[PDB]
Design a binder for this molecule. Sequence first.
Ligand SMILES: [Zn+2]
Ligand SMILES: [Zn+2]
Lengths: 184, 116, 77, 295, 107, 49, 50, 162, 107
Amino acid sequence: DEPWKYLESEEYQERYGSRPVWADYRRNHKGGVPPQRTRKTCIRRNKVVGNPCPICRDHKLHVDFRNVKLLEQFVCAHTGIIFYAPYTGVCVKQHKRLTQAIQKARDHGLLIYHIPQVEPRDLDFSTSHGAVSATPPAPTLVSGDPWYPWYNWKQPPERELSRLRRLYQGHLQEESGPPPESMP
Amino acid sequence: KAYRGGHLTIRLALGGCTNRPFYRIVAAHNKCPRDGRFVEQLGSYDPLPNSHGEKLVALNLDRIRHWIGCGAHLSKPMEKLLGLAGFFPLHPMMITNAERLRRKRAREVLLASQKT
Amino acid sequence: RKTRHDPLAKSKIERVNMPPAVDPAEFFVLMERYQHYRQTVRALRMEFVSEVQRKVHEARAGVLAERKALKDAAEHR
Amino acid sequence: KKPTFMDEEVQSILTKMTGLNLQKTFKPAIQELKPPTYKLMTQAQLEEATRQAVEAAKVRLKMPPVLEERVPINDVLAEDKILEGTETTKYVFTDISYSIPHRERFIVVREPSGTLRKASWEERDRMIQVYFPKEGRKILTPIIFKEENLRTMYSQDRHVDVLNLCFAQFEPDSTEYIKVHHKTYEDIDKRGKYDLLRSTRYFGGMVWYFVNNKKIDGLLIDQIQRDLIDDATNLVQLYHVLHPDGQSAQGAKDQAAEGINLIKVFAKTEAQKGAYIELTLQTYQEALSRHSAAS
Amino acid sequence: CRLIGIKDMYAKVSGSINMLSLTQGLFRGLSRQETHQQLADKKGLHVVEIREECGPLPIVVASPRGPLRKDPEPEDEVPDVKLDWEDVKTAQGMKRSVWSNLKRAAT
Amino acid sequence: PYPPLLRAMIIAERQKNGDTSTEEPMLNVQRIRMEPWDYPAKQEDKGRA
Amino acid sequence: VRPRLIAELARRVRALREQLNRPRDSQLYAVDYETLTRPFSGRRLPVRAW
Amino acid sequence: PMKGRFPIRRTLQYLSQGNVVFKDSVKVMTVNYNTHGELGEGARKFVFFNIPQIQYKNPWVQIMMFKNMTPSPFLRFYLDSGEQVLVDVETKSNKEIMEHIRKILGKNEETLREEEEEKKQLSHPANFGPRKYCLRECICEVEGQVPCPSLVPLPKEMRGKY
Amino acid sequence: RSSVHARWIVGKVIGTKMQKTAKVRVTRLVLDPYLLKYFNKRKTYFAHDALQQCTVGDIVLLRALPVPRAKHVKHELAEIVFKVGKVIDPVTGKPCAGTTYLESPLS
RNA sequence: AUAGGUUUGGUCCUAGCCUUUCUAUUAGCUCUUAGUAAGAUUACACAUGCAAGCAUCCCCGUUCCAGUGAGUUCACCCUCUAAAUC
Ligand SMILES: [Zn+2]
Ligand SMILES: [Zn+2]
């Protein structure tokens, strides 16, 4: 179950050698150009297809982020690009799993890849901006008056209230009421 | 086209999928389709929460100022969001709905107190 | 949507457009909040209009524009 | 006034500490490969090509600025109690613009308390990376900047690339950048692969951190083992400038020391393994006697 | 080229694809290659390589075994070389083909 | 007063362009009139159907 | 461009008919006072004016 | 092989490898050159090699070439203010003519970079439109944010299954 | 200013059979994009001349008009750049026939 | 195109047709779930239901959206400039 043992064991160098795993698979197709996709899976239900892919033909070959020699076998050596499924021979499912293993090993550190030297994001590196320093506080904020004092409820005189009632009587709704202050 | 009568409008344009709204702040004519010719896209507004959760929005404030100076008519969610920003005053409608919720929650607190 | 020559339906041949019931103080403070908000956004819009006009005027003819125009003419000659 | 990192004499001597190995600076990396071009010249044009390669190496080896940490900003612009309790999840506003600098743009947060707080440094960097993306930086913090990952990759001897990923992800004034850089410097002081950090743009920051927080014994050791003797004398000089109230410093200007004697004065005064510095110095002087007899 | 040992080239054939002329033309070209040492001995100057992978670092490959010529090469501006229209078509991007860059098997 | 983000904008840009000038940013309001919901318009700016 | 003479003629005579035979305010703003329905319009009046 | 003596003159990198970008004052460029005589060889090579590059980098300037009608080869430039620049090119080279016209009526490098900076001002990153114009189409792509429903299924907060 | 697209054009006179009008042939260079080669494309302009100074075969400079006069007359004569036969060399401002000096420049 | 098959008693050359690749519509046979994109062949005829109201009377809008591919160089740039928003 735990990988990194078969790859250093004896049966690997007996069946395969210094050659890669995929150096023996030839996909069967209508001749000339192969289809520009492999099968989606070799293992349908719990049965294997007639010509298994290099990953699917050996159940011992487990794939994860710690299986670094397989991962560097399935990624190129002179270029930092991953081998595609028509090039290698693995399924679409196995290609997705091998890719996820590649980037999981890449951000877990157990795989070699090139990182370019990056130029600094900005030119001026000062922190003397109003967005990255303090600001002179508002008069309301040094006090506690609400900003834009027309936000506060202020009851009109009942003369204006009765003028409103004279305008919009008949279909008049219920009465007034000041806001509470603190939510539950 | 020509659009006999009309004006520019800073508004939200839907660009998401089903059960996933996303809005783009654009400068479009009022008489054009919602997802159509905008003269320029001012920013972005995601109302959905992030994994951390912050409901994103970005505004190109100088070009917003430019199109307001050119005469763009703001739409009701748009002055809602600019008031929420602090580029515009807070909106009387939404502080009034805050007030309506004040009184509604006061009523349910009183009713629950009578229940208990 | 409909055009000017579409016949109206019967449920809109008769249908009353009943008015919302009006609350007094929310309505009055709502009018005051509306007039205050419209006044301050009118001020902000006037400021932005003046800013755009100033930008156009200084781009057309400021001091650096005349400076680069005279440099171009002198370099040409 | 104490000379900071960005001064002419310290920059020149730090350049000499770094050194220029062309075969390490311009090195074959595993990227996409294009067929190579071939050119046809004399010895003089070959020397001109090597000079241009040296100048390009200097451009590539221009030194990133070492800067102090930033104060965690907590500034409430406004607080709207009427807004408090209306919405649930916060709102981050960004002035994206195009010509404003990134440390000049304004980004604010509105919370369910009604507080219009200016955005923190981490939220600031995340929103700048979202709306103005730079290559290499991801807004989610990489899992490679965790203890076991950095340990494994230090064991795989990848410290230049630690500093590369850290430069790509974190701004130099950030606490995470500061912590990762000093943790890498502590690991390289524990084991020590200064040659693995030579001819790279982090050598000067490493030397600056060590002479500021004094652990330069291994630097003297590796310098006089690898015959970087003018380099070692200049490093003792940098120490004497940066700490002028040290007994190394008054002993040096009392004895008018100039070279290997400056190194000896330092090792007699404050070197924590000064017996081993003297032992390496006298073995080096035995080697000097050997090749002087050879000369 | 698996029999020879060559691993990385591109080859396009045209005209008549006859096997018995194809193989003989292949052998004629590969045996009438010029190497960098012979090139350097003919011109009298250094042979250098400039890779995009390494950078501006000049990598000397072949130096003359005799004297070094001291007059520089004549920089013939706008040279007279016969280009290929398929190469120029591919370089400028009007080579529209549904067959060229197809994902095939190994080698 | 100016809305708080714009207040931050303009006080920031003035202390970048030089003089501290810590007065509160005010703008003229009495220029704008206060015509309420009563004011009649013009019939030729209007028009009969 | 082949001219649109008949369209221009229709426009001109429509403008002339609108100018000459315009409906007047008497038959425009009349009110059937029991059902609040104006003639020639067919639309009644809003709830704030009954 | 491509037809012609020098096939490099039709390879779209020679054309966008010429250097003269004319100012907005000039409208007509006239090249009077001599087919014979050892002194007009620079003008002949300038007509042969550099006129396509000049026309490619200045698409709206009318370039007219004239044959053996005057005993000396010269360039004339007709400029919108009304100017008529004369540049004799007898006993010169094509590179000399290129440098001369780039100095006299060529736009400066700083002006070209400023124009290109205005184009990069037009190209903005933070906008979210289609891939033809912008860089990302939605924030369904940016990690952390809730993904697109097609790629990742949404939880049952969605409508219908409320 | 002018609503005419062509501000300054240099062309050749074809015919002078219209009163106070000259028919001028303007030849621009248009890139054939497949061959990537510049070929002359010709357009006929109608220029206004008040003095009947231009004969056929002349090389003329035409300026734009602020508003076109006729249906096609959108340009006016600016100068007779090269009169037929009697060609004054402008570099050495001397009369010449072609490739030779009718009057010697060392006069 | 990394090309392949096919003229002949046989070879070489020129040549056409076809194969190998990808996408779309329809037909046959056969089909488990979940999510998401997209969804008359016909500018042929349409039963029926709905799609334009608002609003203190005036106005405004129904001249927009939505649809279709019949026709077809009325779409782009410059000059001038009328509605329209400030
Ligand atoms: Zn498989
Ligand atoms: Zn999506």
